[PDB]
Amino acid sequence: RRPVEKILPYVRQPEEIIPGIPLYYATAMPFRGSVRPLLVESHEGRPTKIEGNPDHPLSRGATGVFEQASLLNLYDPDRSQQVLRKGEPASWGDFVQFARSLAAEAGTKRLAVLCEPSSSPTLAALRRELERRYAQVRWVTYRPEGDDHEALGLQQAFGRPVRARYRFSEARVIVSLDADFLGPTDRNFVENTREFAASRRMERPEDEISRLYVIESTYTVTGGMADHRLRLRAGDIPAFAAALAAELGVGELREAGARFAGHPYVVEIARDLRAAGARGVVLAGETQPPAVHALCAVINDLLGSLGRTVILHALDEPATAQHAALAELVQAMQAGAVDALLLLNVNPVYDAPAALGFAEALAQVPEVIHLGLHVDETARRSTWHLPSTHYLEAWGDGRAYDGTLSVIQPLIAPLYEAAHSPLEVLALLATGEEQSAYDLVRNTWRRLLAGRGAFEQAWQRVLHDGFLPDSGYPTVSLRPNRQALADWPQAAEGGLEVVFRLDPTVLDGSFANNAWAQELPDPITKIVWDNVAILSPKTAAALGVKAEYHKGVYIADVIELSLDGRAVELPVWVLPGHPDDSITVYLGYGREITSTRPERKTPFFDLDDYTDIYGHGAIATGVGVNVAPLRRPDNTWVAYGAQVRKTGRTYKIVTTQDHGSMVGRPLVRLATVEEFRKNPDFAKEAEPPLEGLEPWDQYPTLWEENHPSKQPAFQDSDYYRNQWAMVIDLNACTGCNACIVACDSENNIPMVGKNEVGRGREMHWLRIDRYFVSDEAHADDPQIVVQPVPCMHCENAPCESVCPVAATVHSPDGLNEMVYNRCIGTRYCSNNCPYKVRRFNWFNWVKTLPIQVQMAQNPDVTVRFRGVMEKCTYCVQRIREAQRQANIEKRPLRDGEVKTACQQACPAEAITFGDLNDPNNAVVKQRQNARRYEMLAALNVKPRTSYLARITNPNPRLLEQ
Amino acid sequence: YPGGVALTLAQIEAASEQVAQDLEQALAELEALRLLARRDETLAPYVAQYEAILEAHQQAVLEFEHWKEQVAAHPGDYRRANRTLGAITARHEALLQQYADVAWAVAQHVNPALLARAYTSSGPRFFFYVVPPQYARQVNEQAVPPLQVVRYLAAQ
Amino acid sequence: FPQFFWIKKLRRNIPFMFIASIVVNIGMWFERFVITITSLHRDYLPSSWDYFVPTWVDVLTLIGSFGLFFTLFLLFLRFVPMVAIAEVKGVLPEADPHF
Numbered sequence A: 001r002r003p004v005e006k007i008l009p010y011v012r013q014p015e016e017i018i019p020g021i022p023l024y025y026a027t028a029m030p031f032r033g034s035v036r037p038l039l040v041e042s043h044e045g046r047p048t049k050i051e052g053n054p055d056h057p058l059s060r061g062a063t064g065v066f067e068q069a070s071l072l073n074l075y076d077p078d079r080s081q082q083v084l085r086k087g088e089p090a091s092w093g094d095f096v097q098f099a100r101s102l103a104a105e106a107g108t109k110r111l112a113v114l115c116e117p118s119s120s121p122t123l124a125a126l127r128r129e130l131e132r133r134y135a136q137v138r139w140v141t142y143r144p145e146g147d148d149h150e151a152l153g154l155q156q157a158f159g160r161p162v163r164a165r166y167r168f169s170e171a172r173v174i175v176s177l178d179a180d181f182l183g184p185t186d187r188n189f190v191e192n193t194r195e196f197a198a199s200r201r202m203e204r205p206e207d208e209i210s211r212l213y214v215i216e217s218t219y220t221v222t223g224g225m226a227d228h229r230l231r232l233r234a235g236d237i238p239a240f241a242a243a244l245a246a247e248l249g250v251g252e253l254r255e256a257g258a259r260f261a262g263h264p265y266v267v268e269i270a271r272d273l274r275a276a277g278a279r280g281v282v283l284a285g286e287t288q289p290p291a292v293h294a295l296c297a298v299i300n301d302l303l304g305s306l307g308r309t310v311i312l313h314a315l316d317e318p319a320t321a322q323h324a325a326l327a328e329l330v331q332a333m334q335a336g337a338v339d340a341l342l343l344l345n346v347n348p349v350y351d352a353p354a355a356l357g358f359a360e361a362l363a364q365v366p367e368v369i370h371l372g373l374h375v376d377e378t379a380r381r382s383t384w385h386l387p388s389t390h391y392l393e394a395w396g397d398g399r400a401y402d403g404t405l406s407v408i409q410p411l412i413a414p415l416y417e418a419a420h421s422p423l424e425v426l427a428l429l430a431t432g433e434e435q436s437a438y439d440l441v442r443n444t445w446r447r448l449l450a451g452r453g454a455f456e457q458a459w460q461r462v463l464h465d466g467f468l469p470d471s472g473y474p475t476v477s478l479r480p481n482r483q484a485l486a487d488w489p490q491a492a493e494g495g496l497e498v499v500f501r502l503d504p505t506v507l508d509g510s511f512a513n514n515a516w517a518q519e520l521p522d523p524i525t526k527i528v529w530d531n532v533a534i535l536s537p538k539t540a541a542a543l544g545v546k547a548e549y550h551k552g553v554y555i556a557d558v559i560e561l562s563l564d565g566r567a568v569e570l571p572v573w574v575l576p577g578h579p580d581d582s583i584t585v586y587l588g589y590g591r592e593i594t595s596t597r598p599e600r601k602t603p604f605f606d607l608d609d610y611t612d613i614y615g616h617g618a619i620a621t622g623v624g625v626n627v628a629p630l631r632r633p634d635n636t637w638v639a640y641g642a643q644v645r646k647t648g649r650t651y652k653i654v655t656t657q658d659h660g661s662m663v664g665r666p667l668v669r670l671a672t673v674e675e676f677r678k679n680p681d682f683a684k685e686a687e688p689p690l691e692g693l694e695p696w697d698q699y700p701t702l703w704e705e706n707h708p709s710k711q712p713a714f715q716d717s718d719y720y721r722n723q724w725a726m727v728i729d730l731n732a733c734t735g736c737n738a739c740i741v742a743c744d745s746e747n748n749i750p751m752v753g754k755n756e757v758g759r760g761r762e763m764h765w766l767r768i769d770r771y772f773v774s775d776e777a778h779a780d781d782p783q784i785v786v787q788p789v790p791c792m793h794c795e796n797a798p799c800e801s802v803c804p805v806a807a808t809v810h811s812p813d814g815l816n817e818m819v820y821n822r823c824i825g826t827r828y829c830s831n832n833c834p835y836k837v838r839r840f841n842w843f844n845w846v847k848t849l850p851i852q853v854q855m856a857q858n859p860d861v862t863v864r865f866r867g868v869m870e871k872c873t874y875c876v877q878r879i880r881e882a883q884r885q886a887n888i889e890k891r892p893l894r895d896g897e898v899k900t901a902c903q904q905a906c907p908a909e910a911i912t913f914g915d916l917n918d919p920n921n922a923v924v925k926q927r928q929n930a931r932r933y934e935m936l937a938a939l940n941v942k943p944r945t946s947y948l949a950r951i952t953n954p955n956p957r958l959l960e961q
Numbered sequence B: 001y002p003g004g005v006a007l008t009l010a011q012i013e014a015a016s017e018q019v020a021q022d023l024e025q026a027l028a029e030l031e032a033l034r035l036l037a038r039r040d041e042t043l044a045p046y047v048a049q050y051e052a053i054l055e056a057h058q059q060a061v062l063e064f065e066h067w068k069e070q071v072a073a074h075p076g077d078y079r080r081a082n083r084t085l086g087a088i089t090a091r092h093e094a095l096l097q098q099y100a101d102v103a104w105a106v107a108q109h110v111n112p113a114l115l116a117r118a119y120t121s122s123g124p125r126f127f128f129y130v131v132p133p134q135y136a137r138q139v140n141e142q143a144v145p146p147l148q149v150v151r152y153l154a155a156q
Numbered sequence C: 001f002p003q004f005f006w007i008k009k010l011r012r013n014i015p016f017m018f019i020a021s022i023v024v025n026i027g028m029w030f031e032r033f034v035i036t037i038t039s040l041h042r043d044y045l046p047s048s049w050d051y052f053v054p055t056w057v058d059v060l061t062l063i064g065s066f067g068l069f070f071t072l073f074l075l076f077l078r079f080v081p082m083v084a085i086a087e088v089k090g091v092l093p094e095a096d097p098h099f
């Protein structure tokens, strides 16, 4: 009855790789004008999961959210199958003959690009090899969400271009000033994360800890795992920092910050920073005018910290002024001067505000050429649209943020015929046939290798090691003597703030058709599948909107914000954190997508619409509204003049949490360094052991003589040697939310749709629930807490007892492993568990899964069918291949032979996972620590992942209160 | 189920005697470790790090009698000897392996190198195209000591 | 309704029985929709806080349970005899040997 599913092995065996076993290639990952490092699994030359590069010290083996979804961007459906000309999918072979003849005998030809920001020498050198021939190449780096604004503020401050590195382990006290240094949206998310986390990591009854002082304008994830946070509208943070420095001593600076002479949180920190010279830091976010970053240079130089804000000289790239080029481009479009328009990886029709027109110019000019990954709003309007490779087939070169000089390993052949990666296309413009990127790229290195060993010992070494070691720019000294002090009066007011901000899960919409990311809860609010506007209850109760729910689904009102006659509406959600007259409308989520695959109707007797998330179209359609075109490109994160109109179409908005604010419950139990100094036994004090009875873990049951651990059949295997457990240094855990996504890819899952998750089911195993704790609602100070919660694979384990169909068991080593076969779906596996983590494959999402994503589910784990539970399993899959590899050859399992996904992805080294009963490993040090926070231990459950609490560190008085 | 329980009862005895001979060796090493690294290391958790196994090893001896006597009491159930033997060897090789992991750190501080005679040290699974583990298990077995690990450090 | 039931010597009146016996039972379908579910959300986490929205297919199964019940209860009932006629005429009437 069953099919006869064949096996089609190699013909021309590649010698290194082997069929059953993956092997780790060492790629990069570009975005946002820089290139994170990375490390793939590459099951038989097919990528399945990404990981970190442990050798590269910038990352030391970690991967934020924004990479693991890109792995699925690679395997999307509806990418760029055919080459589209005019909107017609016609043909490629004519284009090469076409574009080649255009290129060789062109002459001046007046072309333009509007690239993704380079951050690579092959791109920047081929630019010169290009510009050598054609006269004027305007070469605008259209930064996502305009100029980065950390750098333009510093080209005058130091007199030349520069980028910072921001160690944070040599530095304790950090005034953020809107800086999402711990934000997946921002760059260098690891080195900002880790050496900040180490400052937060104690391992002692008391240690010197960061004690940041964040003053955000919009509640953001960095402001959560934080101390003494403040809400204060952007466009006025300059006025905040104005009266700030006058209380430090740099200059008068009084007039801009008129009203903050004697504010508590200002005068508080000022004495501290001058009291912490080689340890204090002053950051600056992205929602400002650049004079703030002058002040980030002035005070941070004046403060004495230079080795703590490690500073690095770029390759003479100061020229990223969005006004200066992008308008100046279309000022040539309207004159018929510029003819060709070579976009690389961008959607400026989606982006690029109408205040400085793009589409009005785009339709004027023929010879348009959009290299592109999706087909959104630019392919549809162009005359030529190349398909694009992802970076996995580029042979690209790329710089890590501000440091080393990495290079991609391309893993897979171009999955689609005629993808034609941008780099060789940019060289195809250089009056020759399509340059083999393998040979093209190599030709740059010999001019710039900077290694006395030749290629086939160096190229092989760098392509191996993932990073060219010695690079990393030279470090500049103090250039500023109070130059940049003359753009203050842009502190304008008189209107609702309409500030933009990129969610951790999407970046200028460029990764929207990405389910692992799209169905990813934001850390602030567990929101999915819709852009939003978050704001205070005091404005809501002064505006007239709510987040009412009479079904646990958060029905939502709308705004219909209106800027310069370019209005759109969107759901309004509310948060008790944000300040007056300000809303953080997140981008992406409004990106129209055009499908090649059918909608896949099946009979009404059969469910497809609820399951076929890829059915009704591709993903990025109608998930929200597009918001980028509204802003003004001057200081192009903020905005004024939103004539709000509370209108109808009040539709749903869906979350996983659905609620918040535990009623004084024992689930985070924050504590101060003062209190921690007093009672290290406080993780237990909330629900201590009993009158005269044992400590809580290892507490006897009724049974102790017939307990299975005392019986052989649980004790007799090749496993009991190494009991497994997984603590969480919760003090550095803030909503990066990459603790999830690596679980989703390592131990495969499907996604879920808005129409489905509205009823509250999500097949994310690792909830990353957030919570609010105020002083009994004193001033509505949220003071959030984030904490992941996998299935703490219990010992007493109610769930194990209760599957009648023995689909659960305390497997050896604390593992409580689920079998996705034996279960039947009576779901009472889940109802017992206090932690509703036994998720359930409600519908058969995988059956409707297309012929594209199926590359991605890794070829080592049991994908699951309708009517089946599932849970964490501690990423058992990589216990097995390791313990098996130790069953072949006699050995133990090292401290780091195995790394879980929640471990290996969380850049803050929170999770450690090393086997219990192996005292040299990190877990036994992190469990033997004072705060072995045992979450809901009181139910006599005796679980592993005996994780840690947070220790928020307030300030001595110093006029704090 | 070949011929009953009484066949396996010889080898289960042959395991418990290895444990009994290791009561001497472990407790002997526990003297020697206090002698070798008197003050050459932290030693405050790290010596007790070696003792914490010892109370478990001795506890299993009284059990290995109880495990075994529950078998030899009635030899009519084959599905207890294979299990009691699979438990002993695991509860045995573990404690051998746990002694080692605490004992290799001894060399790791006295010697600046945890030696190349430490473990099989084979490598990951993709390092089988170069080095099958078959080679490694003939390195590990024929080089690494189970509990001649610190007496080896008497040569240092 | 039960503490409003005992009024006129247990309310022998037949038509009140139907309008009450329903309403007594409707609380039972709530009793098990309450006891099971009302403490199965809001149990030991706020993270697992979610209302229960019953679908339009939940209700046609409930209704269908009345359907198959009456369908098959009526079926054999019309075939078998309703009343326990064997013991009826054997217990209370003059089956007693004292006559």
Ligand code: SF4
Pocket: A732, A733, A734, A735, A736, A737, A738, A739, A740, A768, A786, A788, A905, A906, A907, A908, A910, A911
């Ligand atoms: S533990 Fe999870 S939520 Fe916390 S920082 Fe790491 S990945 Fe993010």
Ligand code: SF4
Pocket: A790, A791, A792, A793, A794, A795, A797, A798, A799, A800, A816, A832, A833, A834, A835, A837, A838, A871
């Ligand atoms: S917490 Fe839940 S999933 Fe984890 S072991 Fe206990 S019952 Fe099973």
Ligand code: SF4
Pocket: A739, A740, A742, A743, A744, A746, A747, A765, A766, A790, A791, A871, A872, A873, A874, A875, A876, A900, A901, A902, A903
């Ligand atoms: S072990 Fe794997 S499945 Fe479990 S929470 Fe961690 S990453 Fe997810």
Ligand code: F3S
Pocket: A802, A803, A804, A805, A806, A807, A808, A822, A823, A824, A825, A826, A827, A828, A829, A830, A868, A869
């Ligand atoms: S109770 Fe058991 S049978 Fe399966 S659906 Fe749950 S593990």
